[PDB]
Structures are given as C-alpha cells and as structure tokens.
Amino acid sequence: HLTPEEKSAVTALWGKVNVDEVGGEALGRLLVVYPWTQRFFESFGDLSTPDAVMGNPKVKAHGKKVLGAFSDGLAHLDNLKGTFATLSELHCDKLHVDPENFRLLGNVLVCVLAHHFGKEFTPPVQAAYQKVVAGVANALAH
Amino acid sequence: HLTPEEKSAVTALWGKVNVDEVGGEALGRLLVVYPWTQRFFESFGDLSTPDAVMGNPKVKAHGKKVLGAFSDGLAHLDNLKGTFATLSELHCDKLHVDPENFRLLGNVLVCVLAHHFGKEFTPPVQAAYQKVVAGVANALAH
Amino acid sequence: VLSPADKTNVKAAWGKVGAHAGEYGAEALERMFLSFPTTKTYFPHFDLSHGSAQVKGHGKKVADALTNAVAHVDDMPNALSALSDLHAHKLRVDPVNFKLLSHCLLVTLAAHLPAEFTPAVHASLDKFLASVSTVLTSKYR
Amino acid sequence: VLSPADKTNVKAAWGKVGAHAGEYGAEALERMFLSFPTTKTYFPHFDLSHGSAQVKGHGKKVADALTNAVAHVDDMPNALSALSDLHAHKLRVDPVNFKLLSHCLLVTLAAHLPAEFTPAVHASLDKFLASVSTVLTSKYR
Ligand code: HEM
Ligand code: HEM
Ligand code: HEM
Ligand code: HEM
C-alpha cells in the first residue's frame, strides 16, 4: 500500500525517466555488480568487462523491455500480482531465476534513478520507490 | 501443494515426535547457531553458553508452544495463511522478526528431526518436511 | 576478496567524499530510517526526525569508521575489532540490516557523486561495504 | 572467523566422518536434488536418479574437497583457489545454492552421527560450511 502523496511523487519522477536508457543501465549494472546473473544472458554475446556489458546492444534492448514492465506495474500499482502473472511463470518454468535476484535488480534500479536525478531523489521519493520495487519483486516470485 | 504420499509420510513421522522436547531443542539450537536471535528472548534469562541455552526452562516451555503451532499447521496443511494469521501480526507489529529468521528456524527443525529419526528421515521424507516448513514461514511473514 | 583495482576504486571514490563524509553518513541513516522503518528499533532513545542532531552525530561516527576501514582495507578485521564486538555481542544487530544500510550508502553516493559512480566503482563499493558488513557481524557468541 | 574451538569441533566431527565421506557427500547431493529441484539445472548431463553412479562419484569429489578444507582450515582461500575459479567463473553458480547444499550436508551429518552432532558442533559446522561457501563464491568476474 502506498499513500496518495507517495503515488504522486512516484508518478512525477517516472515521467522524467529516459525509457531508452535507464533500463539498460539498470540491467548492465546487475551483470557487472552481481556477475552470476550473467548465466541467464549467455546468448547476449560478450559480457566480459564492465564496458563490454554496458555497450552490448542486446543488454540495451532487453532493459527497454524490463523498464516497460516496471512502467506497466506503476500504471497498475494496486494490482501487481495480476499485472505480473504471466511474467512470473516465464522466470520460473522456463528458466528458474531465484526470487532474491528480483530484489537485487530493483535495488540497482533505485541506484540508477538516484544517479540520474541527484538531489531530487530525496529520502521520501526513495521510500516510495522502495515500496514499488518490493511490490514488483514479490509479484514476480512464483 | 503436497502429494497424498507426502502428506501421509509427514503425518506418520510427526506422530512419533516428542512434543515436550523437540521444540525446545529446535529453539535452543536457533539461539546457539544464529546468536542475534537472542535479542528477542532477553527476558528468558541466561543464554550465554550452549549449555545455558539448552537448560534454560524458559526456552523449553516456549519451544513447546512453537511446536504446537507447527502441529496446528500440519493439521491444516491446505490453509496455512489462515491458520497463522494472528501469529503473523504477533511477530511483526509487537516485535519485528525479519522473515528470514522463520526460514532459519524451520531448517533447524529439519535438522532436529534428522538427528532424532536417523535413517528413517529418508531423502523423500525430508523433501516433504521442507515443503511444510517453507509453507509455515511464508504464512508467518507479514 | 578486494582486487587491487577494487582497492583503487574504493580509495579514489571515498577520497572524493572527503569533508562531506559526516553529511553523507547522516543522509544514509535518514534514508534507512525512512525506507526501512524496522531499523529504528535499534535506536529507541534517539530523536530520529528530519534534521535531528542525534542522527547528524551518528552519521559522522559511521563515516569516520568507513574512512578508517578504507585506510586499513588490508587489515579491516583488526581495525574494526571493537565495532564487531559492539554490533555482534552488545547490540545483536540482525545481519539483514547491514544490507539495508549498505544500499542507503550506495544510493547517497550515487546521488551526490554522479560522475564518480560508474559501474566499475559501483561494483567495488558494493564489495567493500559487504566486506565491512562481514567483519561487523563476524562474532556474535 | 573460526574459533580454535570451532576448528577443534570441525576437525573432530569430520574425523568421525572418516571413510564414510564419499557416501555422506552423495547423500547430501541426493537430498539437495530432491528437496531443492532447481539445483538440478547445473547438472544437465548427469543421470540424477536414485543410486546413480554419476552422483556417487560427484559426492566423493565434494567430500574430498571438504576433507582438504578441514586439513587447511587456516588457508582455505588458497587450498580452494581452483574450485573458486570453477564455481564463480565457469559455472556462475548463484550464491543461494551454496546455502542449500550446506543445509543438506548438516542434515546428512545429523542423521548419521547423532552423538557427535551436539549444538556446539552444529554451530561450528554451520560456520565452517558458510566459510567454504564464501571462498567458492569470492571471485566471479
Ligand atoms: C524484477 C524485475 C524484472 C522484470 C520486470 C523483468 C521483466 C522481464 C521482461 C518484461 C522480459 C521479456 C518478456 C518477453 O518479451 O517475453 C524478461 C525476460 C527475461 N528476464 Fe526478466 N525481469 C526482471 C528480473 C529478471 C532477473 C532478476 C533475471 C535474472 C537475473 C531475469 C532474467 C530474464 C531472462 C533470462 C529473460 C529472457 C531473455 C531472453 O532470452 O530474451 N529477469 N524479463
Ligand atoms: C517459524 C516458526 C515460528 C513459529 C511457529 C512461532 C510460533 C510462536 C508462538 C506459537 C508463539 C506464542 C504465541 C502466544 O502464546 O502468544 C510465539 C512467540 C514468540 N516468538 Fe515465535 N514462532 C516462530 C518463529 C520465531 C522466530 C524466528 C522468532 C525470532 C527469532 C520468534 C520470536 C518470538 C517471540 C519473541 C515470541 C514472544 C516470546 C515471549 O515474550 O513470550 N519466533 N511464536
Ligand atoms: C557500515 C555499517 C555500519 C558501521 C560502519 C557502523 C558504525 C557504527 C559506529 C561507529 C557506532 C558507534 C560506535 C561508538 O560510538 O562507540 C555504531 C553504533 C551503533 N550502531 Fe552502527 N554501524 C553500521 C551498521 C549498523 C546497522 C546496520 C545498525 C542497525 C540497524 C546499527 C546500529 C547501531 C546502534 C544501535 C549503535 C549504537 C548507537 C548508540 O546508542 O550510540 N549499525 N555503529
Ligand atoms: C561445499 C560446497 C561445494 C563443494 C565443496 C563443491 C565441490 C565441487 C567439486 C570438488 C567439483 C568438481 C571439481 C572437479 O572435478 O574438477 C564441483 C563441480 C561442480 N559443482 Fe560443486 N561444490 C560445492 C557446491 C556446489 C553447488 C552449490 C552447486 C550447484 C548447485 C555446484 C555445482 C557444481 C557443478 C555443476 C559442478 C561441475 C560438475 C561436473 O560436470 O563435473 N557445486 N564442485
């Protein structure tokens, strides 16, 4: 559950996110900082350096899709379990991602937004985004 | 979800558990092996040695209550969320136990049953108990 | 284990924190009390409110300890031996809470030092903060 | 950090495992494949069935490595340097899975060695297995 003021502060900041960049930045950071995550993305080519990972065209294009799903989550913030139902099955049945990795990606996203927005990512906006990213991760766990 | 064969194997072994001892053994082992858990039990007196912890009369009496709740869970194994509803609030509102500690206690219980039953705690009976103890821990998390 | 390159990344980024370290420590504590409100039960006699002086002074203690741990990155279990005693024996702080404060420090550094906070530096800072959290919990009974 | 008493507990209990160590290793793998079936995706070309000879021989490799790590408990990062390379660089095994195998080893030892598996020994074995899991993951990129 989020307060009206939280829902508003969340929405106002997301409107200012670059949807072409922020998701690949977040996914590139997960493969650099938590390198066992690269086991799931071995078809994306070379991931053998921070700079290889952050310039991979396949990492950029997949981060777009993940940021899109986070966006779909923010539009449906009172019904996350039903929003992410199909995707939950996709990360469990086909290829099992441990549910602790969803928590790691959401914290990486919070760092990428802090990095972008600076002194506008205030301790209260972070507290609202943490509620959102925990929401998404629990919704995605099977 | 557990198979009929799992439900039966679980029930047959629990019938042979000493309800006066196994719960204090499990709770005593959590305070020895994961000592930050002692922060929640500072009214139970002295906990400053494995032998102090395992002879504390207050640890034995509280392990009886926890084993009783696990027993209530096994009787209602298809409705754990509603069985443990009141207790979930009790471990969150009054005194916040992180939900990862519930996972640690359930694994300690699996070790105590293995220790007691020997070559009767076969790899399949353990797999059924692991499903039960994960059930209880997710039911208890707020 | 910290690489010589991790040690260089950590030393260079924490060098830029400099004389803003007490301020960064207190913002990290404020972020953690706000986002993860269960963490407030370890500080029952503290005024934990915006602009609080008890949190400003604790933020400064935390950041001095990290400045010390960067200076002694090779012998941290020795340099942090008395903190390890306090957190594991006297305070019985649950290890999950060290991950929460580590996150809040990285968020603070990302918001203040955007040009220093590259993916390589992010990975080195995460390793350093996990290694500090390791020593501070490595004790207990 | 392992106490001299942890080192004594670990050395004495693993001493009693003795010539039953390959057998205990294979029971630990069987328990993990049964209870935690996601762990089976690291072994896609193994016959992972009851009484399997591929699992009997792997159980023996795992237990030899622990016998080595008990013998070199002071210099485990050195003794386990090539295992750390294989698990973190080549296999990219997620750290959660090391906790699962550690649990299955402790359950095996509790079921086989009930008089040795006291609360003090339980605590020392948990510390030792977490320290082995630390070295085997301490690498990665
Ligand atoms: C927690 C937030 C995450 C979200 C919102 C998310 C979202 C998505 C979406 C939208 C897709 C594409 C679905 C499709 O077009 O069929 C996808 C695919 C995938 N995700 Fe995630 N994901 C998340 C976390 C993770 C994590 C933590 C991992 C593993 C470390 C992971 C691994 C994958 C993989 C392997 C695919 C398939 C890639 C391919 O072969 O094309 N995801 N995810
Ligand atoms: C996961 C299974 C667990 C179960 C089934 C369980 C069950 C119970 C039950 C039945 C009570 C007594 C309720 C009453 O009579 O009012 C209780 C109380 C309590 N539990 Fe748990 N519990 C569990 C785990 C934990 C864990 C992991 C912790 C902390 C490490 C914990 C800390 C407490 C404390 C502090 C009390 C109150 C003790 C007192 O002051 O008397 N419990 N629990
Ligand atoms: C990088 C991690 C951390 C560092 C470097 C750190 C450092 C310190 C320092 C330097 C002190 C005060 C020592 C003194 O003045 O004698 C302290 C005290 C304390 N810390 Fe931490 N700490 C960390 C994590 C945590 C966490 C995660 C918690 C709990 C959520 C916590 C709770 C406390 C408490 C309750 C005190 C005592 C406060 C007082 O009354 O003065 N610490 N810590
Ligand atoms: C105490 C923990 C562990 C120890 C001591 C250990 C030890 C070993 C050893 C000695 C080898 C074989 C080395 C060789 O023959 O060259 C090995 C290989 C392997 N291990 Fe582990 N391991 C541990 C945990 C794990 C875990 C948690 C997983 C995954 C769930 C895992 C998956 C593998 C795989 C996939 C291989 C390669 C298998 C093959 O094709 O031969 N290990 N491990």
mmCIF file of C-alpha atoms in Angstrom, chain A residues 25 28-29 32-34 50 54 103 106-108 110-111 114-119 121-124 126-127 130, chain C residues 27 30-31 34-36 99-100 103-104 106-108 110-120 122-123 126:
data_model
loop_
_atom_site.group_PDB
_atom_site.id
_atom_site.type_symbol
_atom_site.label_atom_id
_atom_site.label_comp_id
_atom_site.label_asym_id
_atom_site.label_seq_id
_atom_site.Cartn_x
_atom_site.Cartn_y
_atom_site.Cartn_z
ATOM 1 C CA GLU A 25 21.733 0.977 -17.394
ATOM 2 C CA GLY A 28 24.025 -3.655 -17.255
ATOM 3 C CA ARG A 29 24.716 -2.763 -13.628
ATOM 4 C CA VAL A 32 28.608 -6.139 -13.521
ATOM 5 C CA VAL A 33 27.835 -5.914 -9.760
ATOM 6 C CA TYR A 34 26.292 -9.432 -9.359
ATOM 7 C CA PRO A 50 32.012 -3.561 -17.476
ATOM 8 C CA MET A 54 27.382 -1.563 -20.958
ATOM 9 C CA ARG A 103 15.215 -7.867 -5.198
ATOM 10 C CA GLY A 106 15.028 -3.363 -8.038
ATOM 11 C CA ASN A 107 17.741 -2.017 -5.746
ATOM 12 C CA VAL A 108 20.003 -1.487 -8.780
ATOM 13 C CA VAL A 110 16.882 2.694 -7.291
ATOM 14 C CA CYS A 111 20.609 3.399 -7.591
ATOM 15 C CA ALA A 114 19.438 8.263 -7.724
ATOM 16 C CA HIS A 115 22.420 8.591 -10.109
ATOM 17 C CA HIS A 116 20.225 10.344 -12.734
ATOM 18 C CA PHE A 117 18.103 12.627 -10.549
ATOM 19 C CA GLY A 118 20.637 13.730 -7.941
ATOM 20 C CA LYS A 119 19.219 15.952 -5.159
ATOM 21 C CA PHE A 121 15.766 11.704 -5.417
ATOM 22 C CA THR A 122 15.039 12.880 -1.849
ATOM 23 C CA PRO A 123 14.807 10.371 1.090
ATOM 24 C CA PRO A 124 10.963 10.380 0.775
ATOM 25 C CA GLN A 126 13.320 6.790 -2.384
ATOM 26 C CA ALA A 127 10.965 5.402 0.279
ATOM 27 C CA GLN A 130 11.416 1.048 -2.474
ATOM 28 C CA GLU C 27 21.791 11.138 4.823
ATOM 29 C CA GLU C 30 17.901 9.181 7.313
ATOM 30 C CA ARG C 31 17.287 7.152 4.112
ATOM 31 C CA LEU C 34 12.550 6.241 6.180
ATOM 32 C CA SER C 35 12.618 3.343 3.704
ATOM 33 C CA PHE C 36 13.245 0.501 6.164
ATOM 34 C CA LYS C 99 22.457 -4.919 3.645
ATOM 35 C CA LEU C 100 19.876 -2.179 4.170
ATOM 36 C CA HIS C 103 22.096 0.100 -0.009
ATOM 37 C CA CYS C 104 21.387 3.500 1.566
ATOM 38 C CA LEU C 106 25.351 3.465 -2.230
ATOM 39 C CA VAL C 107 22.153 5.485 -3.023
ATOM 40 C CA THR C 108 23.616 8.502 -1.180
ATOM 41 C CA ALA C 110 25.127 7.815 -6.373
ATOM 42 C CA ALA C 111 23.027 10.951 -5.723
ATOM 43 C CA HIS C 112 25.999 13.096 -4.605
ATOM 44 C CA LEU C 113 28.876 11.850 -6.789
ATOM 45 C CA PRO C 114 27.257 11.005 -10.182
ATOM 46 C CA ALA C 115 30.467 11.272 -12.272
ATOM 47 C CA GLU C 116 32.480 9.077 -9.851
ATOM 48 C CA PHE C 117 29.720 6.451 -9.561
ATOM 49 C CA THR C 118 30.499 4.395 -12.675
ATOM 50 C CA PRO C 119 29.523 0.657 -12.964
ATOM 51 C CA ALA C 120 33.090 -0.388 -12.030
ATOM 52 C CA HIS C 122 29.566 0.733 -8.031
ATOM 53 C CA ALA C 123 30.813 -2.897 -8.086
ATOM 54 C CA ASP C 126 29.330 -2.882 -3.107
#
